Amino acid sequence: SMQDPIADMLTRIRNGQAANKAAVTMPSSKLKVAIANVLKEEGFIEDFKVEGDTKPELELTLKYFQGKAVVESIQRVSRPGLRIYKRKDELPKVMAGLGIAVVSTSKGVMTDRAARQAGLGGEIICYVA
Amino acid sequence: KIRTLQGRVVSDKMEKSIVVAIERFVKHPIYGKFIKRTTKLHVHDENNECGIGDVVEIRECRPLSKTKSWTLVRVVEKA
Amino acid sequence: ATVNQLVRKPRARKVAKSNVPALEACPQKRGVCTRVYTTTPKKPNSALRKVCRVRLTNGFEVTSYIGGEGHNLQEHSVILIRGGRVKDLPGVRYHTVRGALDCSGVKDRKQARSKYGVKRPKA
RNA sequence: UAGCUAGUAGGUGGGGUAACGGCUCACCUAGGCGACGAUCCCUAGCUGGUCUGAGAGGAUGACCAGCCACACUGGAACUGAGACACGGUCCAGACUCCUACGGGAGGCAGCAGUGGGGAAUAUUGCACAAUGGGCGCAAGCCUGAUGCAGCCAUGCCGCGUGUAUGAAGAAGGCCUUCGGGUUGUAAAGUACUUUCAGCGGGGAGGAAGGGAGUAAAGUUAAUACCUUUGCUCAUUGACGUUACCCGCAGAAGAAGCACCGGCUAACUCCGUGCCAGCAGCCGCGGUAAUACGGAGGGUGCAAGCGUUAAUCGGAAUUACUGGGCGUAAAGCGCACGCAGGCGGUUUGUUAAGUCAGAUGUGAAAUCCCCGGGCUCAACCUGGGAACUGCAUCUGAUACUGGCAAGCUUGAGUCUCGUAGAGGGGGGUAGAAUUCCAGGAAUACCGGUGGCGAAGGCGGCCCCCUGGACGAAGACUGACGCUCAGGUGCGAAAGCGUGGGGAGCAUAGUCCACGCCGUAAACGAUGUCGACUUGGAGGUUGUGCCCUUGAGGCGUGGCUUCCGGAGCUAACGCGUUAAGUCGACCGCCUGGGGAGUAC
Numbered sequence: 061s062m063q064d065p066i067a068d069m070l071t072r073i074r075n076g077q078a079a080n081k082a083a084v085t086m087p088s089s090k091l092k093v094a095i096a097n098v099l100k101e102e103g104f105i106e107d108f109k110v111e112g113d114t115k116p117e118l119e120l121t122l123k124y125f126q127g128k129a130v131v132e133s134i135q136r137v138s139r140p141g142l143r144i145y146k147r148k149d150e151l152p153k154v155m156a157g158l159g160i161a162v163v164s165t166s167k168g169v170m171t172d173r174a175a176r177q178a179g180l181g182g183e184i185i186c187y188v189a
Numbered sequence: 190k191i192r193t194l195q196g197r198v199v200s201d202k203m204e205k206s207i208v209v210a211i212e213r214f215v216k217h218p219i220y221g222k223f224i225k226r227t228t229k230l231h232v233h234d235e236n237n238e239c240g241i242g243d244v245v246e247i248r249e250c251r252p253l254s255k256t257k258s259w260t261l262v263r264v265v266e267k268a
Numbered sequence: 269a270t271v272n273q274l275v276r277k278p279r280a281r282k283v284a285k286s287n288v289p290a291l292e293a294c295p296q297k298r299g300v301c302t303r304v305y306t307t308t309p310k311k312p313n314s315a316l317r318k319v320c321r322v323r324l325t326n327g328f329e330v331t332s333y334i335g336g337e338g339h340n341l342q343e344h345s346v347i348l349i350r351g352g353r354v355k356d357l358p359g360v361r362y363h364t365v366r367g368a369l370d371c372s373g374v375k376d377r378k379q380a381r382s383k384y385g386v387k388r389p390k391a
Numbered sequence: 392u393a394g395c396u397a398g399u400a401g402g403u404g405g406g407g408u409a410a411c412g413g414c415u416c417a418c419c420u421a422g423g424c425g426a427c428g429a430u431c432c433c434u435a436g437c438u439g440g441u442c443u444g445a446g447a448g449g450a451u452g453a454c455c456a457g458c459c460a461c462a463c464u465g466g467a468a469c470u471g472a473g474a475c476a477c478g479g480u481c482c483a484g485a486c487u488c489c490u491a492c493g494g495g496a497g498g499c500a501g502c503a504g505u506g507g508g509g510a511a512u513a514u515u516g517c518a519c520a521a522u523g524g525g526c527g528c529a530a531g532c533c534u535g536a537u538g539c540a541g542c543c544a545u546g547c548c549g550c551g552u553g554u555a556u557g558a559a560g561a562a563g564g565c566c567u568u569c570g571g572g573u574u575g576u577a578a579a580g581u582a583c584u585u586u587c588a589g590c591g592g593g594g595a596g597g598a599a600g601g602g603a604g605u606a607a608a609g610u611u612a613a614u615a616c617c618u619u620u621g622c623u624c625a626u627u628g629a630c631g632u633u634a635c636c637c638g639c640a641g642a643a644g645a646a647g648c649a650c651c652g653g654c655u656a657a658c659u660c661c662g663u664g665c666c667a668g669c670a671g672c673c674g675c676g677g678u679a680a681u682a683c684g685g686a687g688g689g690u691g692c693a694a695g696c697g698u699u700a701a702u703c704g705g706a707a708u709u710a711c712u713g714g715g716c717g718u719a720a721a722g723c724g725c726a727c728g729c730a731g732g733c734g735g736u737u738u739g740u741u742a743a744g745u746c747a748g749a750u751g752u753g754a755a756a757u758c759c760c761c762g763g764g765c766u767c768a769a770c771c772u773g774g775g776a777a778c779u780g781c782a783u784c785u786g787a788u789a790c791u792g793g794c795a796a797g798c799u800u801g802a803g804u805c806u807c808g809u810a811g812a813g814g815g816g817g818g819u820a821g822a823a824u825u826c827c828a829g830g831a832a833u834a835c836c837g838g839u840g841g842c843g844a845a846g847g848c849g850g851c852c853c854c855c856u857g858g859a860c861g862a863a864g865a866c867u868g869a870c871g872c873u874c875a876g877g878u879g880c881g882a883a884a885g886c887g888u889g890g891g892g893a894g895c896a897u898a899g900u901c902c903a904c905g906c907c908g909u910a911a912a913c914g915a916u917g918u919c920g921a922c923u924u925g926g927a928g929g930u931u932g933u934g935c936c937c938u939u940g941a942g943g944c945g946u947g948g949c950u951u952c953c954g955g956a957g958c959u960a961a962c963g964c965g966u967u968a969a970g971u972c973g974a975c976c977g978c979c980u981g982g983g984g985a986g987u988a989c
């Protein structure tokens with residue numbers, strides 16, 4: 061990317077959700093390992109392998125259950141220059157809470173249940189559905 | 190001790206008196222954007238011990254002159 | 269638009285103006301009867317209508333339609349205006365209070381009385 | 392409206408106020424504020440909240456409550472704890488008033504009233520009985536603040552104007568195809584009850600204090616006096632011939648108003664015939680008007696109903712949650728860029744951004760939820776929640792941000808070649824072409840080529856210069872992308888000054904020095920970056936491969952031509968986007984008047 065590494069990643073993934081390729085790959089900062097170690101665990105994709113040490117870079121495995129593809133409607137919201145630092149008792153539940161809401165907390169990125177369990181919100185990263 | 194408001198020096202063409210701007214973020218009240226806004230307030234100091242371009246710690250004081258109600262405490266930056 | 273195009277200048281309005289300029293924030297103004305004119309409407313209509321130009325009290329002079337079923341106007345006395353423009357005649361953007369100071373009612377309507385100077389007939 | 396400002400901006404000093412002070416007077420210093428909108432002209436009192444909106448947001452500031460400003464119009468002060476002083480003084484005037492002409496009085500932006508301008512907004516009311524105020528040792532005085540009463544459907548929430556039964560489906564009205572139908576169980580007539588108003592009689596609480604007596608452990612002469620506590624009588628309301636309860640008549644006093652073509656709930660007939668007329672838009676009327684006028688019947692609402700005026704809503708129709716620009720209004724003709732906005736990649740670190748935790752604080756009253764009181768409801772009300780806020784301590788380090796340290800892909804310099812109407816100057820000169828000499832500029836290549844940021848630029852060779860490209864290496868370590876103003880380059884003509892005159896429009900066209908910035912200056916498609924089915928041709932390279940070749944597989948770059956998904960109102964775009972996005976800039980919000988008035 062030039063001027064957001066995480067926004068321009070989220071174009072790269074769901075273009076794989078429009079031709080149903082197997083593996084996708086983007087140049088991977090240490091933040092970017094902490095991105096898809098949430099999407100795997102909540103079940104939206106399957107497996108990933110970092111590789112490279114002068115170009116640290118990922119091998120994400122997609123997940124399309126049918127002709128239907130699992131990662132339906134992912135959206136970045138906090139785009140740079142429009143930071144929305146949510147207080148935690150405003151929190152965006154995604155699609156009546158049926159999805160997950162990736163929030164950049166202190167204690168990590170892994171965020172469904174920061175509403176009650178962790179107990180501190182922050183900058184939204186992206187809605188996920 | 191109030192907050193020890195950090196600021197800069199903009200100009201010194203005055204007799205024992207300086208001009209301080211202060212960096213300051215804010216939510217823009219209707220759009221939700223962060224505009225870096227700065228103010229401009231005259232500050233009393235005697236020794237001319239800070240130069241044009243430093244970084245200054247400031248508390249309030251008695252209103253000495255017109256247009257100037259802040260004394261220097263100390264300086265944390267050379268020119 | 270971009271956020272930093274709405275910042276340095278706000279969203280300006282879409283300004284709305286008044287089309288009853290005999291307000292002065294009022295609903296009814298008094299008038300002293302310049303003439304009675306009998307001009308004609310446009311192409312889809314016929315049958316020339318009854319209008320009067322009116323000398324107001326704010327300082328203006330403007331025209332007004334004298335509807336009903338026949339009128340009673342010697343032309344050096346008082347009327348009262350209502351607004352609510354006629355579509356037909358070019359320039360008449362008013363009405364008259366049918367039954368007011370010096371401009372009495374119409375000769376015996378019996379449906380929709382109150383919008384003209386017709387009161388309860390006999391009972 | 393882009394410049395403003397000298398007591399202006401600052402410092403020693405005196406002087407000055409209750410207080411810091413340029414608050415003033417001499418002196419020195421030469422500043423101060425400003426695109427994060429100063430001076431300027433126009434307009435306006437500000438908030439808690441009211442209205443509307445699901446929300447954000449939008450117009451509002453009347454009432455009750457907070458805070459300033461002003462007392463006929465300009466001034467200055469005196470007293471005072473407090474004023475630059477509404478029912479005080481002085482200086483003027485101005486109106487206004489009065490005068491023996493010499494002079495004196497005047498101020499409803501107090502309540503109640505007149506004139507008047509007005510669409511229109513009320514009584515020359517009663518009481519100190521309440522709660523507050525002032526003065527007091529209280530008594531009490533005083534209070535056009537408050538407590539009340541008249542005025543007016545201006546608004547809100549009740550409430551009645553009767554309920555049963557009843558057809559022969561009555562006379563009656565209009566419709567009628569003359570079979571009838573409908574009004575209509577409607578009425579009549581039998582049953583039945585009097586709310587409220589009429590009228591009659593008793594009849595809560597808003598009243599505690601105060602004053603009088605009489606008791607107490609009071610402190611002092613131990614019982615004088617007084618202060619406090621408890622007891623006893625008399626008491627004390629404007630409203631108010633009160634609220635409410637009770638008594639008797641007799642269906643008895645009590646129903647309008649708009650619409651009826653479409654949106655929009657309700658229809659048929661007479662009269663009129665593009666005349667009279669309706670109307671919010673669509674529109675109706677020129678012999679059969681479900682729209683005009685009238686009559687029956689219907690609809691909706693109701694003691695009001697319509698009309699007009701006024702704000703939001705529908706309006707995603709100024710869009711932050713919630714828009715758009717290839718043709719529907721809309722991408723500056725094009726370039727670098729200043730202040731602005733925005734970060735590759737790793738570690739350290741700080742804790743401002745933000746999250747968390749409390750502690751302050753957000754006046755009470757409205758809004759909101761459980762709960763009380765008026766016979767219910769409006770309304771009055773107890774407690775909560777909420778007031779989305781700002782300031783402080785403690786905590787958190789993932790993102791972001793300043794400081795410190797790095798690494799190679801963004802970018803950038805070098806080497807090295809390659810292709811080319813990129814220009815500037817200098818002269819050159821014909822495949823061609825009028826006059827008696829020379830003005831012009833390409834025939835060919837010439838094209839879907841090719842250059843450049845665009846307008847653009849084509850003879851030939853050299854000269855100074857401009858950009859891109861490829862093959863490798865090398866090192867710089869974020870050094871970048873974008874742009875309001877800003878400054879350049881700017882098709883024709885026109886014009887200026889200095890000449891010419893053929894091809895041929897009589898200057899001008901042509902060179903040149905200066906203005907002029909204009910246009911289909913129309914990819915009618917800002918810019919950079921990364922991603923996604925493609926297929927055939929263009930042209931520039933250059934790696935591998937018997938190069939064994941004109942040639943294959945790659946692999947660079949830009950430009951064509953048709954087309955998937957996706958998208959678009961279509962038409963269509965479609966790896967050079969308009970498709971999925973991110974950062975930033977320009978611009979539009981119905982047509983005419985108008986690229987015009989000043």
Ligand SMILES: [Mg+2]
Binds near residue numbers: 598
């Ligand atoms: Mg009583």
